[PDB]
Symmetry: C3
Subunit: 278 residues, 3 copies
């Protein structure tokens, strides 16, 4: 492999995070006060890393941080039941741990933490974060395994109820790339409804990484994946591989969803920066 690959993990990382009410009434996570985003900032670690997150809730209501897939003690559950939420103006240190796969004492295989995961609130609105998730308190988490292929760029697409990344319908978001770029997509679904994520002119493997192991990987190759609330998957593609440059549509394939504007553009540019037709 002549491409960049993820190293071995084991580092102890520290992070500061805030929950902010936005001017339009939404709620977002951020690494800096005044720089929150919906979806929240991407967190990327390696198998074996430990992450300490000093989380500060700047809003006037209780908020929390809850993560999927990664190892965390009950004190970092992010739920009101386990007293793991954060009071208004408060600060709490969450700890997320990751581990590598390996054989157990009984001989069974313990799975690793690697995967395309996500984090979100769990106490805003209801005891399951229905209000916080609706307001935009969600973000992606990537846990890499040693040797995983590293992309050129990563984009996060969240189907939150009837929006993409809490945006107004018919407003994208759109992304750009050049023919040959290794583009990574993190695909998260939240809210009430099922969806189907579809991409024109591109396909991926329905497995952990979206890439086939090799000639023996039996995982199916798809361009349409059904998703429900709290589903998260990801993949890597070569922009324009075997199809060339163009304005390549991605959208939900539930007919009324795409009709109502749950559509975006994957703009794959020629080496001279042009998109065929435009």
């Amino acid at each position: 492999i002549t491409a960049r690959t993820a190293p071995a993990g084991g580092e102890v990382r520290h992070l500061k995070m805030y929950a902010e009410k936005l001017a339009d009434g939404q709620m977002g996570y951020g690494f800096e006060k005044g720089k929150a985003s919906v979806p929240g900032p991407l967190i990327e670690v390696n198998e074996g890393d430990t992450l300490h997150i000093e989380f500060t809730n700047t809003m006037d209501v209780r908020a929390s941080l809850h993560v999927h897939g990664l190892d965390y003690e009950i004190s970092s559950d992010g739920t009101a039941m386990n007293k793991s939420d954060v009071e208004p103006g408060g600060t709490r240190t969450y700890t997320w741990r990751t581990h590598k796969p390996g054989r157990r004492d009984d001989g069974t295989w313990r799975p690793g933490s690697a995967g395309y995961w996500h984090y979100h609130d769990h106490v805003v609105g209801t005891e399951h974060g229905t209000g916080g998730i609706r307001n935009g308190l969600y973000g992606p988490v990537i846990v890499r395994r040693k040797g995983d292929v590293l992309p050129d760029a990563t984009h996060t697409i969240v189907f939150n109820d009837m929006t993409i990344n809490n945006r107004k319908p018919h407003t994208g978001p759109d992304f750009e790339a050049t023919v040959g770029d290794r583009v990574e997509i993190v695909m998260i679904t939240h809210g009430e409804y099922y969806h189907t994520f579809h991409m024109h002119g591109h396909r991926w493997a329905d497995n952990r990484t979206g890439i086939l192991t090799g000639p023996d990987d039996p995982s199916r190759v798809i361009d349409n994946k059904i998703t429900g609330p709290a589903d998260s998957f990801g993949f890597q593609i070569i922009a324009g591989e075997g199809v060339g440059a163009g304005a390549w549509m991605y959208h939900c394939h539930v007919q009324s969803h795409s009709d109502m504007g749950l559509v975006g553009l994957f703009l794959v540019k020629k080496p001279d920066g042009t998109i065929p037709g435009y």
Copy 2:
């Protein structure tokens, strides 16, 4: 492997089953008159076993037994069309067969019967058992392959429309375990609606067993799975592995579903029987 493993099948097993109307208007299967349950009793066999079920319908309406995955002749279809239902007060002997995987005469690979399956009624209410399934006429079936890891306990979680195991919302059910227990979950969905099964602090493999074959198994590791009517899957987890004891929530992640009480507790106790915080 120093853990208990499933032996080779081939035994001819006999079983007696009843369909009972319950005092509250529900309908349940049972191995003994007056001891019906919703969900019905678990049936567990090994690949190659044959199961003869003497089924007695004690109710005042026609009922039947229909199974997924296992081998059965058209006489054991459990449908009115094939005259395989049971009249009120009647008794009928169903036969379920299982087989091991192997190579066919043409060289192709024939799949085995192993998996996490389920049984349910097919004639109460409608010709597809809509009334019987709603009333609680469903239960799990496990078919083990030789060498499959055996658990310490098995729990069945059924998303039947807007209930868990036909229970009133906000009433669980809850389960208990100790840190280190090998807990098996059988997850069945019935009715009208899609769902997403989610577990806090625990994850499994999205394959036949929920366990990874080894370092080569490309199956994805998840903690959130979308399900539809008649879907059935299962997995095994080590209670508290890498996360410790605590009141670990399992729930549907469709936001209104968890808000309306489709939540339960996986109580993982410390060696001294305590749950952190309680």
Copy 3:
């Protein structure tokens, strides 16, 4: 393997297709004027083949051809945005390409085009073909990999909203086979709703081909699969394997869907042409 297997691809194939308004108001694809069908004709190629489709839109509204999975340039996108639709009475030549899997220059594995895909309209009614898909402008595409097992017959089952193959509910369609036949099913879903495809007495692998690679294939074996709009999968079964002849039901397992008539019959006949009971 003593069964028929797919050869190596690489041929350049030519095809003529029409879009026709039908007398009942539906819309169908066809290889001949006056011989359109819903679902449209099956297109079957091998990995490496190139397909040139001379498509003629005979209807009074704009129509197009859009394919999943296969390689196509932006000029064959089939969308109004990319000026790839066809005017009333017009003719346009689409090009679909396929490729074999292989190792990239960076050492990564490029997936092949093989799979169970489908084609449909993208501009009738809305800019996503909501009207054309509803009217019946959809059909299956099979891309075979060298060595793939060839079936005795292929049947296409499309869950288009609340219909099977745009048929009136309670009208099938039904299929026939003989015990031992190698039957292939192409299963496509379109429209607004999720479904679950279920088959009595038969099961398949949830992978690319529906067949297990061998003793090492970890893919799950199922008889119930959830599907959403634009999902496409397929499989092969031996008719009556381990279960014998009979009228074997296939249906959606969403309870109201089967109750409303989204049911069909897989009639597996004895060597003398009889179905047990009839």
